[PDB]
Each structure stands twice: as structure tokens, then as C-alpha cells.
Design a protein around this ligand. Structure first.
Ligand SMILES: [Mg+2]
Ligand SMILES: [Mg+2]
Ligand SMILES: [Mg+2]
Ligand SMILES: [Mg+2]
Ligand SMILES: [Mg+2]
Ligand SMILES: [Mg+2]
Ligand SMILES: [Mg+2]
Ligand SMILES: [Mg+2]
Ligand SMILES: [Mg+2]
Ligand SMILES: [Mg+2]
Ligand SMILES: [Mg+2]
Ligand SMILES: [Mg+2]
Ligand SMILES: [Mg+2]
Ligand SMILES: [Mg+2]
Ligand SMILES: [Mg+2]
Ligand SMILES: [Mg+2]
Ligand SMILES: [Mg+2]
Ligand SMILES: [Mg+2]
Ligand SMILES: [Mg+2]
Ligand SMILES: [Mg+2]
Ligand SMILES: [Mg+2]
Ligand SMILES: [Mg+2]
Ligand SMILES: [Mg+2]
Ligand SMILES: [Mg+2]
Ligand SMILES: [Mg+2]
Ligand SMILES: [Mg+2]
Ligand SMILES: [Mg+2]
Ligand SMILES: [Mg+2]
Lengths: 78, 161, 93, 121
RNA sequence: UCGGAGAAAAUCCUCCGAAUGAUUAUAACCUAGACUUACAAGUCAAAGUAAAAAUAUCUUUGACCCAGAUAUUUUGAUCAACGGACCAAGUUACCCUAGGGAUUCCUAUUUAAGAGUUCAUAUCGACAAUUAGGGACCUCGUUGGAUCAGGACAUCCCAAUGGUGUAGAAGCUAUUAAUGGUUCGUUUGCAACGAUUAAAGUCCUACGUGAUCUGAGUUCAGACCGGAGCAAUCCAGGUCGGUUUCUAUCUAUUUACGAUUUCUCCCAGUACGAAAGGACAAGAGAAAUAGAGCCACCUUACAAAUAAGCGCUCUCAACUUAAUUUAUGAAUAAAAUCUAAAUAAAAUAUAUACGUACACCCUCUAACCUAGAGAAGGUUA
RNA sequence: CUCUUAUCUUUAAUCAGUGAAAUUGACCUUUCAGUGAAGAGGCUGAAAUAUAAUAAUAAGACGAGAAGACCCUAUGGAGCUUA
RNA sequence: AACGAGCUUGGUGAUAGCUGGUUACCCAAAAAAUGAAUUUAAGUUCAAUUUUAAACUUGCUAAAAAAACAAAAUCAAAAAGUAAGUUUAGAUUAUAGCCAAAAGAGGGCUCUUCUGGAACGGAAAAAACCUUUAAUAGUGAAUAAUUAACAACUUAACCAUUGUAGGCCUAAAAGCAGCCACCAAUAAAGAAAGCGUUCAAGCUCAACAUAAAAUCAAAAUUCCAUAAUUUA
RNA sequence: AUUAAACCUUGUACCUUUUGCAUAAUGAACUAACUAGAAAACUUCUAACUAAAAGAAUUACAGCUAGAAACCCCGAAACCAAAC
């Protein structure tokens, strides 16, 4: 199977896109040490939201109006 | 036995093929590089001296075409000429050109073209040369110089008398 | 067709992306009263603002993060250059 | 055996010509990444599938903003081939509370803080 | 069943052992935390207490039930099919049901030591080359014929050629060509044989082809021998005998051609050759078979006016092309060179340019017909 | 049998009366090459192609019917023999 | 009117780990065909998975040094990107895979390990290759993969004499059977390079002279889309 | 889709199985009617009353009581008893 002309170009185009991806990942704004702890607070709060919803499950309230409203099915014009 | 490659691998091979650098102009079409200084082999310098020696030694130099006669028959001519103390000389023409270009003899260049033989001696037995030439009829004489005087065959015949 | 050319001009590759053609209102009342905002535009405005806030938040955390590491190093530097008491010598100290 | 791959570090050490080609200063590095998914994770190993969801790049051609910090970059290097990384650029500065609702991310990678939909004039 | 060792976490992968004993300073009870593990089973152990005044040292397995032995404590499996039914073998071709299946030497190229008197390649040809194609142990793994054939060329004969260790004639080898042809018997599990032939090709088409036919086997119900088994029975051991039917729904198909080979004669007993022997090409006549027809004769019938063969007659042209061989002639300075140079020719089998045949335009009560299943078609003083 | 032929009867066929069977997913039911399970009317690619009967042929529709053949399975049977 | 053992009724709705079948809509989630035992391998029970509900808290990716090995997984401080996880209660089904690509081991199969796949697009038809985040209505748009690809280049004119048929079993071998060394003349030529050889004479190559050029190249039914070398 | 029934374009019948695969293999001439999931040990949901609940015998260290919520059809060769 000889490889087509169009097939060869499309691979090259993708390779160039990834080649640039190498360049932009080579200049970290922060070093490994400076990174430590800069996002601690946001992470801590996010889990608290996760736990709060998980531990808040409970049955729903029941109202008399729901049960009594069924009688309206026999509502009429006098 | 070749095993078929995955198409993705085959695509990788196709795009990574070697590409040679291409010159804009062919080197042949371009002017040819100048020749470096040449080396004289130990054939022209030694033979150059031989050409110098024969001209210095022999006062008369007469030129005749090579006849491509059998060497077994060249011998008898050489032996016959040796009995008359007249010698034969043969040299490559191309290395003979530079001296003949710049020497006492410069109008003999047309004579020194192609296969040729040289009549060299110390005595002007020019009449006997015809007798030695008459021994073999078909051999012709082209001309040359006798006693340092350049002349043609017809003039040589008159000079012989 | 024309995707790459549009990208070179700074435009969206798809004419349906960001530009007057899509984002502008498609109609208004004859009296001149503006039409209610289109649902797609309202969603697109919401997503764009959400991305704008994220950009602000991450930069502040990183910028606040480097300053924290900056002042921390000063404390380590100060901690090293410390001493106390006194330094006698000889036959008694 | 197909296994996770460790790239030699030399790949991510740029050359002086690279800076000229891509127009990026090795000093004052950019802060935020613009990353879009441009390939599918189908037919890719599960570890690549996992990171794409972690990074938020589930939908293709929809940009995500990420921190240009080493830990994030490590994840991006895993899926480098499935994404396009573009530096986020702020010609008119960071968006403020007033301009937070008037921003627009251009294809060039520039986040403008005023979007008018009018001829430049 | 389990343990040890290699491969290394696979194997019908390769080895060694165990269903142990020896050795004794005799080796308690109780109790944190762990290993291993589907379950069951199997491991290690601090602290405390108690005997003594160092542990046992070598290095494994069988549950529950149920039976024992005792003064509480103990013992019971080649249950080895080793998660173990308390205790049960053969045989079936007389069979049944429920299902699952299946139905190495060639040949072509490359190389070329040696064969060939001499001489690698007339004819062959070691060592090799070709992604070149084809066909545990002793036992044992559908195809003939008939009918009608379609196709391949890797050509057996017919045709055109190159080479020769080709004088002729016989041969050997190569190239091109798929044209039509390629027999009748004896023996009868095919394998040889007899007589011929121009030749008696090699193969593909689910044995090409059993809703076209038929033999043997697959292979059984009966029966015998030989062998095995206490027997019933058995044998990829002999033999004799032994019943598959189908009315066609669909596709497909059911109305012409322009010929092949052999023998004799002539050339000519010539050419060739010392003789022996012995031809080309050109030309003439005969047969055979195949195809297409026909009935004056002959022959067999209807003991009919017809139908048949065993009787009779007729059969042909090639525009254009392959191997190969000539002519002119450049690239290549020639009195070179057949030319995937421009050119002019000759030269297999093929075939359809080219001809034959067909064409007409449609009365039909009915009758008759060498036309016919019906219909159609032909004839009518 | 070489090597088949003729005649007569039965059947056949046309007309009149009566009137079954297996079978049947639906069919508006083609050829070639490819693909594919040895495999194609229905798929891929080329090609062919007014519509319907009547009478014939049996290559295909793994053509239609049987309690057939062969092998394997079941902690399914049964007959027979014993040690 | 089908006897290896009659027929009828009843036991009897015999039993069948086996074949076949098992009737409305919508939404959601989803294994894997792994390990173990079994007269077990056409079955079943347990683990493992999956799932519903509930409780409360860290999980997933990653993970330095550093140990354990020999001289890419196990382990998992800090972080970071992210939203799952553990435990309790209840519950079936499943426990034969298929193909592609890697690494091995038996020697193309047959096994074990690791990754991926199940188009409605593409590769001709095409479960498994490649492009593809679900599901929609629209006579809008930008794109992905995408069976096609563009035969061959030191050797061209002329000549060849002589010491010597040179030592040698060889009849004879003279460059060229044999074996031997391996120099002379000649402006120019091998004590000879291939030929030929009763043996030699004999055919050329190298000698001399004059003579021009300049490494490998991507069989069997009936052919089978049609075609095409240049417009940016 | 179309102005237009057919022409043009797209499109490898259904069920059951086979490994998730159908050009496999079963089953179906067609119509009408008939023709196959059934139980409350534990669990969950909804209520009564509550250190007690239940209309006698039972359970109980928040339980107990009541309700609702569940587990197919056809088919052998055979075996036995009594008649014919
Ligand atoms: Mg246990
Ligand atoms: Mg202790
Ligand atoms: Mg057992
Ligand atoms: Mg066992
Ligand atoms: Mg065990
Ligand atoms: Mg018998
Ligand atoms: Mg034939
Ligand atoms: Mg041939
Ligand atoms: Mg048949
Ligand atoms: Mg008989
Ligand atoms: Mg018939
Ligand atoms: Mg003749
Ligand atoms: Mg009738
Ligand atoms: Mg029709
Ligand atoms: Mg039709
Ligand atoms: Mg076909
Ligand atoms: Mg078709
Ligand atoms: Mg018919
Ligand atoms: Mg048929
Ligand atoms: Mg059948
Ligand atoms: Mg069993
Ligand atoms: Mg009976
Ligand atoms: Mg039953
Ligand atoms: Mg079973
Ligand atoms: Mg057992
Ligand atoms: Mg951590
Ligand atoms: Mg294409
Ligand atoms: Mg079957």
C-alpha cells in the first residue's frame, strides 16, 4: 500500500502542531518549589462542599395540604 | 519473509524518507574547475633531453613518414643504415611540439605530424640517403633540414646533386 | 473552505463563530424597540464570562503563590543568621 | 507490551531558533495555557483517557484555561499529541469586574476585554 | 493429591522426593497484633501466668458422619478418583431418547566445480542461491464407470522457428502457438499386458456432472471361518447375502454457417552420401472422422403412399499477427546494426474486417399439407 | 454391445367433466469478476435488460421429503453376559 | 400394519444440568467469558466484579528521594490537576469470547502477559484497522480520517619483433603439457595474459607509436470503472 | 423525494442462536382466536402505638404491629400397578 500524497501531508500538519506544543511546555512560569501550597485553600473548601452534600441526605417533608388537596378532584360548580 | 506493517507505521516511514540536498546548477554545466599544477612524469623530461641531445649532436635532421613496415624489415633498414653510419630516431610528437615551437627549427612543425621517423647523422651523405631510400621504393620522404638548412624533398634532390 | 484564511485575518475559522454575523441581533420591532436577547447569545455570553472569571482566579492564585514563597525565603534567610548567649574561651566558658 | 512512555528531557529544552520561530521569550514566560482537544481518545490507552477528563478537555475544539506550572505541564505532556497548546495573551490587560462580561477569546489567543462587534473605524 | 528445583509470573515443559522416620535436655497453659485464604484448612507471635534453671533438632497429607480405647483423655483410610458416594463390573453391529457436531521429490529461473576424447553451458551438471511455484509408545488417516462436457497451457499430435557433438534420415534441446483431435480390448483391485495410432498430453471444474443413470467403499440387522474373551460380544482381519424417494415453483438453458487428419503417387532412389541409406517445398488422387443434408439405388421395417443407416451427396475464403528470418539505415568516423530509432517485407494457431443464409409483410369459415404437441406456418384450377 | 432403427400400445399433447400431494419468511426472483466460512439472484465494481404465456431440459436455489449414516455429550435409558 | 419385548388406563402435570418458546411504552446503570472447589469442565456454590439504598471521609491521576531487587511495575512525604472513595444493608446475572498490535514460551498454530476496538464516515464490499464525547429539528457552516503512487551512463585505433625450441622425468613440449627461476637487447615489446596445441607453427591482450570520451536508481466461466502526462 | 405511479439516489428480510460476527444454522404459507413468573425467611417503602407492640399462646437492650413489594410454559426414551 503506497501512502497517498494527501495522507502524508495531513500527518505532517499534525506533527507541526505537536512540535509547537513542545515549545510552549518548556517554559514553566513557576518552579516546583514555588508551586507548593499556592492552591491549598481552594482545594480544602471544594472537598467540604463535596462532603456536605454527601452527608446531607434525608427524607423530604410531608404536608397536610398535599393529602387534603386530593379532595379538590371532586370540586364542582354548585 | 516480509510481514506487512501497520498502515500508521507505513505512513511514518513514508514521511521520514531521506531527502537529498539539490544544487541549483549542475556542476557539469558550470565552467570546469581550473586544472591544478601538473606533474612531469619521468618520460617527458628525460625524452626532452633526448630531443635536445639529438638536435645538438646531429647537424642535419631530415624527416620521413613512418611506413608501418614489418620490424623484421625495419631491422635490415636499420642495419643497412647502420652500415652507412646513419641513425634512425623516433619520438612522441606531442612532447616534440614545445621545442619545435621555440627552437632554431620552427617551420618543420607541419612535418612533425603523425607517425614519422627522423634521419639523423653527423655527415651529409644526402645523396646516399636517396640510395638507401631507393632500396625500399614505397617509403617516401617528407623533407626536413640538412646541414642546418631547411628544405623540401625536391630541393633536397637538387642539393644532393 | 476558507478556514485557514479566516484564521490568518484573526477571525474565527468557522463563519458561525465570533463576529457580527452571528453575535449581532437578527431582528427588532418595526417601531424600533429592541428584540429580546437570543438564547444562543445569552448562553455564549454566560460561557465567556465564566471563562473570564477563571482567568482572573488562576492568575491571582499563581501571583499570590509566588509572593508567599518569596516572603517565606526571607524567614529562612533570617533564621540562619541568628545567635544568642556569649562565646567565652580558654580555660573557662 | 504497550506501556506508559517517558520522554527524554531534551525534547522540552528549546533552541534559540525556536524562540524566533514561535516568538516566545525564554524570560517572562506566559502564565496561562489555552488547550483544546483536537483528536479523539478512542483507540488511545486508558491513562490518556483519564487525563483528558481531568484537564476538562472532554469536548473537542472548546478551549480550557490552565496554569503554566510544572505539575499541570506534566499531565499535558502525557496527552501532548491529542491537544493544541496556545499561550493566553492579554493585549489590554486582565479583565476586571466591570469588563468581566465584555470579554472575548480570539482565535489568535488574545483575550480582549472590550468586544463591540463594530467596524474598527 | 502435595513438597523441592529450572525455564522465570504459561506448558502434554524438565528433574527429586512424600504419604517420612531419626534425634532427643520432652517442648505447658493462656493471650495483643499479623500472614495466607472463595469457603474449609494452614502459618508466625510480644505480653502475662506456670513448670524447670536451651529451644525439641533435623525440613509432609484426609473433612463430616459414624464406629472404637479409657477414666476425662485419646485412636480410626493408597477414603491415592487424595473436598472424600457406607457398599455396584463388562457388553450392544438388536438398540432407544435428548442434544451437540461434522458431513520429500519434481517444475522455472541464478551460480558453475566437474561430465562431455579436446571444449562449463550441443546435451547434462555437485556444494549452494529463488519472499520462486507445486504435489508416552505397537498401529492407521471417499472414489470407479456411463452421459454431456466448460476451461487453463505447464503442448501429446497437427502448424511456424533457433541451436546442435544437425552430411542425409533418424534424434536431442529451446521458442511461439490452445487450433481441432487425442482409439479398442484383456486381466478387476486399478496394476501390468495385447493390438493399433499423426498422437493415445498434463490439469481445473465440491469423484466437473447420482432431483440424468450405475459399480465398490462408508457399513450396519443374517451367517460363517482365523484370532481375542469365563461369557455377552469383539476385530479401521477373511468371505456369502442384503430396499432412497422426488409430479420442476424460481433462475439458467432448448434453431445456420465459410473442415480436420492420415496414406499412396509425382518430384525421385533424385538432393545428400564412400557406401549403407535417404529427404524437402510445389503438384495429383484416395480414404477416415466431424459437421450439414438427402432417398435414384441398396438394406431394415410399417407384410401402407414413409421413416432410418448399414446407403448417397456436399464441405471454402483471411484484411489484419509471435517466436523467427531478411532489406534500407542513424545514434556509434563502418563496405556496421532486422529498428521497445525513423522505415520496407516475409513469416504459426487464431479470427469475421470479408462473404453465404435470412429479408417479403400478412387473406384465412373451412378443408388438406412432405408444417406441427398446442399455437404458428404452407397450399386452394 | 459395435450402433441404432422401424412399427403398434400405454403415457404424452389439444378438447370436455371432476379434481389431490410434499412444499411455501417476503420477492418487483439476471450474467461476469471481486469479497466471503470450498460458499452470492439480492453485498462491491463492471455488464445486460419491453411485457406475458405454452411445450421441453435438469446446472443452481448446500433444491423437497424418511424413524439414514458417522462422531461426541448426559452423574438420560434399555437388552444381554458375568468372575 | 415399526416388539431387545404387546396394548390400554392409572401412578402422571413422571423426570429432563438438554432443545424450543416466554405477550405494552419510557428513563437510567451494566458486567466478562477472571481465581477456587466439584463423577466437575453443556451445571452449580464461593470469591471477584456490577448494582440499589444508607452512613461519613478522603479518593483518582501523579508520586521525590529509598529502600526491597539485581548492582516497570510493587510501595507513596509534600504538592498540583481533579471528584470520587471507604463502610453497612439487599440482590441477581455471569463464570466458553472474537479480532488487531506489542512481549514472551512451547514449535503457522497453542498457550501467558500488556493495549485497543464493536460508524450511521473512510479503507471497494469490510464485527475487530483508521476518523468519531450522547440524543435532536433546520434547503446553514468550518472540518476529520480518506488506495493509491509518478528505464539506466578506463575503452575507443594499431601492432606485434628478437638472447631462447631458456633449466625439467617429458618422444616432444618452445610464454602458453610438466615443474624452474623469472634477467637481456631493442625508440617498443610479459621468460607470458587468454586462445591453439602429433609437439610446434599458431589467434589475440598487455609493449611502442599515433586515438576520443568520462555510484546506482525508489492457470483453469469472461479483461474488468471510465479515463488522463501541466491553468498557478 | 419529485410537477409526475415507475426511471434518479440511499438501502446485505425477521426471530433464535452462535465470540458482541451474518452471504452462517434453526423456526415462520397467510388470517382469526387461544397460548408461558406463582410463594414473604431477611431486606426496603408507608402507617398505628411505643419500653412496649399484637383482638390469648409471639417478639422486644426502639421495638412491635398492619399494609405494599417474589421466584414460567411445552417436549422424551423410560419405570411400576391393574385390566384387555
Ligand atoms: Mg478461613
Ligand atoms: Mg514470653
Ligand atoms: Mg474427584
Ligand atoms: Mg478432587
Ligand atoms: Mg486444594
Ligand atoms: Mg451381525
Ligand atoms: Mg472440451
Ligand atoms: Mg507456451
Ligand atoms: Mg446433482
Ligand atoms: Mg440372492
Ligand atoms: Mg424431472
Ligand atoms: Mg516431397
Ligand atoms: Mg379438462
Ligand atoms: Mg414481472
Ligand atoms: Mg424481472
Ligand atoms: Mg460471483
Ligand atoms: Mg447485484
Ligand atoms: Mg416450463
Ligand atoms: Mg436444477
Ligand atoms: Mg436439502
Ligand atoms: Mg457432570
Ligand atoms: Mg403393533
Ligand atoms: Mg419438564
Ligand atoms: Mg450439564
Ligand atoms: Mg467425588
Ligand atoms: Mg498524596
Ligand atoms: Mg480516496
Ligand atoms: Mg445442523
Amino acid at each position: 500500500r503506497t501512502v497517498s500524497f494527501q495522507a502524508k501531508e495531513s500527518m505532517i500538519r499534525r506533527l507541526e502542531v505537536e512540535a509547537e506544543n513542545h515549545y510552549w511546555l518548556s517554559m514553566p512560569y513557576m518552579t516546583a518549589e514555588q508551586e507548593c501550597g499556592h492552591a491549598a485553600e481552594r482545594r480544602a473548601q471544594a472537598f467540604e462542599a463535596i462532603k456536605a452534600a454527601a452527608t446531607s441526605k434525608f427524607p423530604k417533608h410531608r404536608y397536610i395540604a398535599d393529602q387534603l388537596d386530593h379532595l379538590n378532584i371532586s370540586k364542582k360548580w354548585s | 519473509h516480509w510481514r506487512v506493517m501497520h498502515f500508521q507505521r507505513q505512513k511514518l516511514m513514508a514521511i521520514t524518507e531521506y531527502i537529498p540536498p539539490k544544487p541549483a546548477i549542475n556542476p557539469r554545466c558550470l565552467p570546469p574547475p581550473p586544472k591544478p599544477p601538473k606533474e612531469e612524469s619521468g618520460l617527458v623530461r628525460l625524452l626532452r633531453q633526448d630531443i635536445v641531445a639529438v638536435f645538438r649532436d646531429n647537424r642535419m635532421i631530415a624527416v620521413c613518414q613512418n611506413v608501418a613496415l614489418s620490424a623484421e624489415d625495419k631491422l635490415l633498414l636499420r642495419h643497412q643504415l647502420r652500415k652507412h653510419k646513419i641513425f634512425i630516431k623516433v619520438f612522441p610528437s606531442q612532447v616534440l611540439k614545445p621545442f619545435l615551437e621555440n627552437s632554431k627549427y620552427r617551420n618543420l612543425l607541419p612535418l612533425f605530424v603523425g607517425h614519422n621517423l627522423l634521419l639523423v647523422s653527423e655527415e651529409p651523405k644526402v645523396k646516399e640517403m636517396v640510395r638507401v631510400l631507393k632500396s625500399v621504393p614505397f617509403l617516401p620522404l617528407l623533407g626536413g633540414c640538412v646541414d642546418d638548412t631547411i628544405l623540401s624533398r625536391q630541393g633536397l634532390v637538387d642539393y644532393a646533386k | 473552505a476558507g478556514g485557514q484564511w479566516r484564521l490568518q485575518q484573526g477571525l474565527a475559522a468557522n463563519p458561525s463563530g465570533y463576529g457580527p454575523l452571528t453575535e449581532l441581533p437578527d431582528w427588532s420591532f418595526a417601531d424600533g424597540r429592541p428584540a429580546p436577547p437570543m438564547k444562543g447569545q445569552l448562553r455564549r455570553k454566560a460561557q465567556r464570562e465564566k471563562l473570564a472569571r477563571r482567568v482572573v482566579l488562576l492568575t491571582q492564585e499563581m501571583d499570590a503563590g509566588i509572593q508567599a514563597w518569596k516572603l517565606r525565603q526571607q524567614k529562612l534567610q533570617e533564621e540562619r543568621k541568628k545567635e544568642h548567649d556569649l562565646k567565652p574561651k580558654g580555660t573557662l566558658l | 507490551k504497550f506501556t506508559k512512555s517517558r520522554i527524554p528531557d531534551k525534547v522540552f529544552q528549546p533552541k534559540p531558533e525556536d524562540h524566533e520561530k514561535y516568538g516566545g521569550d525564554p524570560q517572562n514566560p506566559h502564565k496561562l495555557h489555552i488547550v483544546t482537544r483536537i483528536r479523539s481518545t478512542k483507540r488511545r490507552p486508558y491513562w490518556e483517557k483519564d487525563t483528558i477528563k481531568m484537564l476538562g478537555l472532554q469536548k473537542a475544539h472548546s478551549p480550557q484555561i490552565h496554569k503554566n506550572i510544572p505539575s499541570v505541564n506534566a499531565k499535558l505532556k502525557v496527552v501532548k499529541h491529542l491537544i493544541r497548546i496556545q499561550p493566553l495573551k492579554l493585549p489590554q490587560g486582565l479583565p476586571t469586574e466591570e469588563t468581566m462580561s465584555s470579554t472575548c477569546l480570539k482565535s489568535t489567543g488574545e483575550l480582549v476585554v472590550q468586544w463591540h462587534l463594530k467596524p474598527v473605524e
